[PDB]
C-alpha cells in the first residue's frame, strides 16, 4: 500500500508545514505538523485544558467508535525549543492520504505549553523519528511510520517541502517525476533515535567548497538551519552589515541586503539553498533588520538540517533494516 498527502506552509515565512490527517471513525480531520525530529503522535483534544486551546481543531475520542483508552499510559514531551505537552493515550485508526493504520497510539494532550496554544494552525504533531524516542510510559509506542512499514510497498517516505508553496509527503513509493538528476544516499546513525547523517562540507555563494564532516539530523519539525559557529560565521561574513545580536538571539542582517546561496554536501553531490530561502523577514513589524535562516548550533548541542535546508531538496527517508537518507535536487 501507499499514501500521499499535500503539506502546506502555515504562514508567509514557511515557519512550519501542516498536513491533514484522518483520525477515528467516522474520520476527524486534524492538521498535523509532520516532525522527523520526534516520535510522538499527539493532538489537541476534548481533554485539553480549555484555557490552553485557541482555535485548534480538537480530537474527541468519545465520538470515535474505534477509539480505545490505553489503560494507565501517559506521555510527556519537551522539545529542543522549550515547548512541552503531556496527557493520556488512546489507540485509534489513523489515515494519511489513503494509507490506513489501525491501533495507532494517539496521544491526547491534557496540557500544552503556550507556544502551542498561540499556534492556531497546528492541531498536533506526527512524529517520524525512530520509535526509541517515543515518550509513552510504561509501554513505549510505535510511530505511524513503524506501524505502516510492513504493508508499505517500500519501507520509505519522502518529504518534498515547497518554498512559499504546498508540497508533498509520500509513504511507500518514490515519485521519480518529483526530482531532477539522481538521488544520492548517505548512511544514517539511529544511535540517538534521529535521522542522523554526516554532510561532507559546504560552500558560501560561489565560493570554494570546503570539505569537512558536519554531523546533524534531518528534521522537518525545525524551521531553520543550525550549523557550527565556524560555518555560520563564514556565511554571514559575506553579507554586508550582518551581525549576531544577543537581544534578538541570532544573526540579523539589513533587509535591503541580497543573500548569497548556501551549498551543503551529500556524499559527492551538492544541494544548493537559494539565498531567498534564508530570509525570514523583519525581526518586528516595520523593522529594517531581518532575521537570518542560518543560525549557530553552539547552544543546542547538535546540528539541525531543518526546513530551510530540506525544502531545497527531494528527501528520501529509507526505513529499511539498514536505514539511509536520500537527497536529490528538484
Ligand X SMILES: NCc1ccc(C(F)(F)F)cc1
Q: Which residues are catalytic?
A: 35, 199
Tell me whether strands 294-296 and 225-227 are parallel, antiparallel or unpaired: parallel
**Shortest gap between Cβ of 197 and ligand X (angstroms)?**
14
| DSSP three-state, residue 267 | coil
User: Interface with ligand X includes 253 (CB under 6 A)?
Assistant: no
**Polymer length of the chain:** 330
87 contacts: CB under 8 Å, gap ≥ 6: 42, 45, 47, 48, 74, 75, 107, 108, 109, 110, 111
Among 7, 22, 28, 38, binds ligand X (CB under 6 A): 38
**Chain residue at closest Cβ approach to ligand X:** 80
Considering only residues 120 to 149 of the shown chain, the ones binding ligand X according to CB under 6 A are 122
Using CB atoms within 10 A of its CB, is residue 227 exposed (0-12), middle (13-18) or buried (19+)? Answer: buried
**Cα Dmax for the chain:** 60
| Rounded Cα distance, 100 and 20, in Å | 13
User: Interface with ligand X includes 115 (CB under 6 A)?
Assistant: yes
Task: Between 286 and 299, name the residue whose CB sits nearer to ligand X.
Answer: 299
Site mask, ligand X, residues 161-200, x = CB under 6 A?
----------------------------------------
Site mask, ligand X, residues 270-309, x = CB under 6 A?
------------------------------x-x-x-----
| Rounded Cα distance, 85 and 267, in Å | 38
**Shortest gap between Cβ of 236 and ligand X (angstroms)?**
22
Which spans of this chain sit near ligand X (rule: CB under 6 A)? 16, 33, 35, 37-38, 79-81, 83, 115-116, 119, 122, 219, 221-222, 300, 302, 304
Amino acid at each position: 500500500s501507499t499514501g500521499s498527502a499535500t503539506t502546506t506552509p502555515i504562514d508567509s515565512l514557511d515557519d512550519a508545514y501542516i498536513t491533514p490527517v484522518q483520525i477515528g471513525t467516522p474520520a476527524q480531520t486534524l492538521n498535523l505538523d509532520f516532525d522527523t525530529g520526534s516520535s510522538d503522535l499527539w493532538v489537541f483534544s476534548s481533554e485539553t485544558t480549555a484555557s490552553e486551546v485557541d482555535g485548534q481543531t480538537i480530537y474527541t475520542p468519545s465520538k470515535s467508535t474505534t477509539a480505545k483508552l490505553l489503560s494507565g499510559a501517559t506521555w510527556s514531551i519537551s522539545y529542543g525549543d522549550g515547548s512541552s505537552s503531556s496527557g493520556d493515550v488512546y489507540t485509534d485508526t489513523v489515515s494519511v492520504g489513503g494509507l490506513t493504520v489501525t491501533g495507532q497510539a494517539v496521544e491526547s494532550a491534557k496540557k500544552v505549553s503556550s507556544s502551542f496554544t498561540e499556534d492556531s494552525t497546528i492541531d498536533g504533531l506526527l512524529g517520524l523519528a525512530f520509535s526509541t524516542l517515543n515518550t509513552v510510559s510504561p509501554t513505549q509506542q510505535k510511530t505511524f511510520f513503524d506501524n505502516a512499514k510492513a504493508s508499505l510497498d517500500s519501507p520509505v517516505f519522502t518529504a518534498d517541502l515547497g518554498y512559499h508553496a504546498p508540497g508533498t509527503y509520500n509513504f511507500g513509493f518514490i515519485d521519480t517525476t518529483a526530482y531532477t538528476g539522481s538521488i544520492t544516499y548517505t548512511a544514517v546513525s539511529t544511535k540517538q533515535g534521529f535521522w542522523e547523517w554526516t554532510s561532507t562540507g559546504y560552500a558560501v555563494g560561489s565560493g570554494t567548497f570546503k570539505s569537512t564532516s558536519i554531523d546533524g539530523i534531518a528534521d522537518t519539525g525545525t524551521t531553520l538551519l543550525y550549523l557550527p559557529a565556524t560555518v555560520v560565521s563564514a556565511y554571514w561574513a559575506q553579507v554586508s552589515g550582518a551581525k549576531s545580536s544577543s537581544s534578538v538571539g541570532g544573526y540579523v542582517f539589513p533587509c535591503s541586503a541580497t543573500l548569497p546561496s548556501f551549498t551543503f554536501g551529500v556524499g559527492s553531490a551538492r544541494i544548493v539553498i537559494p539565498g531567498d530561502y534564508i530570509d525570514f523577514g523583519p525581526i518586528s513589524t516595520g523593522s529594517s533588520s531581518c532575521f537570518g535562516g542560518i543560525q549557530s548550533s553552539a547552544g543546542i548541542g547538535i546540528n539541525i538540517f531543518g526546513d530551510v535546508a530540506l525544502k531545497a531538496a527531494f528527501v528520501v527517508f529509507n526505513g529499511a533494516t539498514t536505514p539511509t537518507l536520500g537527497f536529490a535536487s528538484k
